[PDB]
Symmetry: D2
């Protein structure tokens, strides 16, 4: 199960080099040279890596100092053949965004949040990115009267339109993707899930330039079905980038490697992702636990990629199994896929097969045969 | 704090006439004649009532029996003077809806789901209903391959589109509201939150006919901030209806009387509804606990309207207090409604005040003053 | 993976005989006679069955047909070879237990709660039962003032103290087990987790006759690690019985097939039970979903024993693998099993290897090797 | 509503001097002087303060700078009257405890965490502390095979036995209090709830010197009822200490100021604390957010004591209302205090008022009048 560059396996600069700075602890790991990150990930069969601004260039560094990091990072990508499918902007680490970036109560920092994320859009496009991600972790509140949510969404819509107007002006080959999260650090984060994010996009001035960037743990932090949420994002056709990791239950944002936590949800996710034809990157926004040294760093990195391919093979033979194909026909997934009343509204009203002469008891007495179907989905995951 | 018909308080027949039958118990109170319940809320001060079709006419009743129950029900509303603002259909009780109604795996049961809905939509217009609520409690799955999520949404859009074509072909002054729910009775219900519903509406053929009907307990079942959900629903102008009750955490849908559970979330909800000019019905989808009698089902019902009205007084006097206003201004609540960059994108880029000449240390050093503000909101809530 | 009577699998009568009644729908399947349930459970490979006070005999039946139901069941146990390891009381269902059984507010129900329970432990002794289970599904309240939970625990202690008195008086070889559950149908259930139950045991008059009966789903309704709670129960030596089912997320009690939901928690559980040599019954307290016919409830019942045995094979080969034991050496699982201060306290005070001359950074720079260890367990779980 | 030292209000050194450094951001506030915090707290009405060993005295400082940090602080407490009722050991921040303190997988660091706790014990007793808190927030793991919980509970059982032997050896009058937390920083924590801790204490060799220190937020982080959890500790008589904060829903440990979050659970807590006669310190383990400057952290701590005085005032007026006293008797809370069967087990058997002649129908038809009681509690709290 060793990965190939055509797997589109991307990471970030914040994934490893996390140092393990826990809310209740200090650092444990070494500050990873942004160059030496892209080494091992190329040596581990990955394709591409992502980054924030402050992850690549130090905060406050001037142009020719910033330019010195971009060139050192450019030679590393060209020597190892790695790409950069996505870039981001840091709007949470610095204490200036206590009340958010695009939705801050102060107007000064709101305009500073735009200039900071605009200078980065130029860097994102000049590195061959295919999507720009915006994570509004600081956009939230702890008390009620501290933020009018209608006014904050007025500013978030105004901010995204300003960005979309900028990319259309410069003609960059890019599209945005909002990464939702229900809470942390704020008591409640604005646009907390894929549904809240997808609805927000449909009001933006140029909706075709925006998508969603769901992450496994974030939606599982609200008790929601991630394979169901990805399906709604795919059904709307607004799935531009995906963060993969593991998470158990409703707790703090634990960024375990992909495969850990909800293993069944990881199975159905890779099943839906490959069956739908998603050809974007398989990004991993995970953190190796601070329990590890500089040798368990890449074991967690290679682990989430080695996992992804295992469930990919088992979910493929699950759909290719003829015995399961008949169990899906028993579950009547042959129906459900064909239209309900494609004969029209008037034809449905005149049809008594749907009302007067519809034997309600016979249809109700038919078992859906879901258990025998789900057990076959089980045995394919373990191997039997 | 006595409720009046001016407050537009409606309740519903299944609410205060609930069996008391939970998954581990039989019935405590007897069933109620729908007329008995109508006289009842009229004496307390309710303005309207809502109902499922099976709550007014019993399932499997012929024409003469379904047309003798409406007459006794019509005479009750003509006497008490109460109106029917909302109506819904029952597609979860009968064992023919184990797999669902609009997204059932069986092609024939989906049509009866629409034939039973159309018959009740046609009668809702007779009683002067102006919003028809749809709650898909059985639209979902408990295992992965048991339901194609993209195909299920393909049938729910088709379902919803043909009844929008019906109400327009009939000229009924009626729109639709979607009641979202994350789980229960199914393991994972499609369109779980109000955002997933709002994202689903703008893919329908005529999005102006359909809105969201949020309920307190449902959004709190996903760990979400309910007053944040309505603010986004009001932001899109799709708060066609609302259901008011209580919930104490991520548990089962208990549907206790409004005001109980998350008391602070009800204060912020009643503050947002009144301050936004919402004019729809304030309707309680609550179930009195099975431990009560027939004198306790209306001591709890009266507690629903009172808990609202005394919260309406504490929230009004809060935002009307002059001391909270500069306390609000100290939190820069006025600068949040101010447009970030109404000067244009070209003016924002040429303004180095928002970047190089921006002092991030001085902007980060300000105090926000949220806790002094939140304590004033705690004082008006408690009466101190 | 065919189960044998020596695996000692147990199935409740209500388990596969659940007609499918949730708070939103009617029944789906027929009523299973207690006789036919035994013969079908034994053809699949089970070892014994479980019954409630009202699952074997109907409520309010005369003592003539009471012995008939027993003798008619007493036809099917000897003629089959199945057993009855566990018996319990049905102190819910009936409206008499609106507020509870042993901790009701009315003494009317508290005394009847005990007379009904002792009436069944006489039957449990005749059937050779070894563990009598009590589940306080109705003990609690939805409001704060409705129950002085200090006086309530005084009544659970009062009721449980005399139950062990009747057992010690009749010379029965019978022990008790507490089934913890956090919520549903009550708002908050007394003794919500295993720990609260174990603590309640150490305050009763005879803590020797009382243990716990934890269910994998009841503890996961509070986000707790179920393999952790079973480990504490085994460390205290009080795991008299165990309930096996499935549940994914903090929601209503789903009672899914074993292995469904959190499969990782199911893997580390079978690994824990087989490591400590737990020789009790593998009792499955699950409910096949309402979507199944009668053929679906047995393929699901067989699936419970099916995936326990497959998890038993992977967990055994995991710890019996040579390269896994060497990873436990790198993870230092040796030292946690070694005594900390076996040399005494005064030697601990005179040892500077544990304070002054203890290298802080050289001990903090070591890697725990937890992730490479966990992927080794993941490759064994998936059979890679 | 201004508090006095008679109210025993204490605050943590880490509470108001939190600096704001969180998972997603750098520090916001300046580091406060320990001598300053006590001045500021005494002029607000507080009675005492707490401290970790690394909070009062920085890590790695000399023995000369040690008592320099201790003396000037001691001179501050006696010059203003503040005491130190509580103290605890820091066993989480330094990367040495990245696997844990008492139950670390390496023996050399297990003995180190003990030799650090006994030193702060010598100081805690010299300053006049009455309790000492041992919260093992780094006890646990994230993978299944990383921690053998049975052998880990042996190392914690061995740990507390040593420190309890040291207390009885030095002649100190000091008792321990375990502060339980479900999750964070580790995936799953050992002894996650109050019950898990209480059951762990009864196994310890000298259980008289050990109790619980429950946190309001820590218990509802698993959806548990905190007023239910305190009175089980009050039942066992092991509530040596308690922490006051706020939390809204199952998520990361917010620790808002007391009053915020579950306002109703905060009401029922001080109601039980006053009725049960709690004389321990009303300690606050809250953290004012990043948003506040220095003037807000004192207003937040001021409202901390303010919300306790408001709730205690309305809890006393609730249980002293003549109308509530009769409503509690209509709910038959008085019969909950009466013993179930004080006449003996034989009389329980021979009395058929509790069985054969018991009116099961008339007893179930009685209402508990819980809703009217809960409304009176609402009206008393909401000033009506
Ligand atoms: Mg994350
Ligand atoms: Mg509901
Ligand atoms: Mg259960
Ligand atoms: Mg059981
Ligand atoms: Mg805390």
């Amino acid at each position: 199960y060793q990965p190939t560059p055509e797997d589109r396996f991307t990471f970030g600069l914040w994934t490893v080099g996390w140092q393990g700075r826990d809310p209740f602890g200090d650092a444990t790991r070494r500050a990873l040279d942004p160059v030496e990150t892209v080494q091992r990930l190329a040596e581990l069969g990955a394709h591409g890596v992502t980054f924030h601004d402050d992850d690549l260039i130090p905060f406050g560094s001037s142009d020719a100092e910033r330019e010195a990091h971009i060139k050192r990072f450019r030679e590393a990508l060209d020597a190892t053949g790695m790409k950069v499918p996505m870039a981001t902007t840091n709007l949470f680490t610095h204490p200036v965004f206590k009340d958010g970036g695009f939705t801050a109560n102060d107007r000064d920092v709101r305009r500073y949040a735009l200039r900071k994320t605009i200078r980065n859009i130029d860097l994102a496009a000049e590195l061959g990115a295919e999507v720009y991600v915006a994570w509004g972790g600081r956009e939230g509140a702890e008390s009620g009267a501290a933020k009018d949510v209608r006014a904050a969404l007025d500013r978030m819509k105004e901010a995204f339109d300003i960005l979309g107007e900028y990319v259309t002006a410069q003609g960059y080959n890019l599209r945005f993707a909002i990464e939702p999260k229900p809470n942390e650090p704020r008591g409640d984060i604005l646009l907390p899930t894929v549904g809240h994010a997808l609805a927000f996009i449909e009001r933006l001035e140029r909706p075709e330039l925006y998508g969603v960037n769901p992450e496994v743990g974030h939606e599982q932090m609200a008790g929601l079905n991630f394979p169901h949420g990805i399906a709604q994002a795919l059904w709307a056709g607004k799935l531009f980038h995906i963060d993969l990791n593991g998470q158990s239950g409703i707790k703090y944002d634990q960024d375990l490697r992909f495969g850990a936590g909800d293993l069944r949800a990881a199975f159905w996710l890779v099943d839906l992702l490959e069956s739908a034809g998603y050809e974007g990157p398989r990004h991993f926004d995970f953190k190796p636990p601070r329990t590890e040294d500089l040798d368990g760093v890449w074991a967690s990195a290679a682990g989430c990629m080695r996992n992804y391919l295992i469930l990919k093979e088992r979910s493929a033979a699950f759909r290719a199994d003829p015995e399961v194909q008949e169990a899906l026909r028993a579950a009547r997934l042959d129906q459900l896929a064909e239209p309900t009343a494609a004969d029209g509204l008037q034809a449905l009203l005149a049809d008594r097969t749907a009302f007067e002469d519809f034997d309600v008891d016979a249809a109700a007495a038919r078992g859906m045969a879901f258990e025998r179907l789900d057990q076959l989905a089980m045995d394919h995951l373990l191997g039997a």
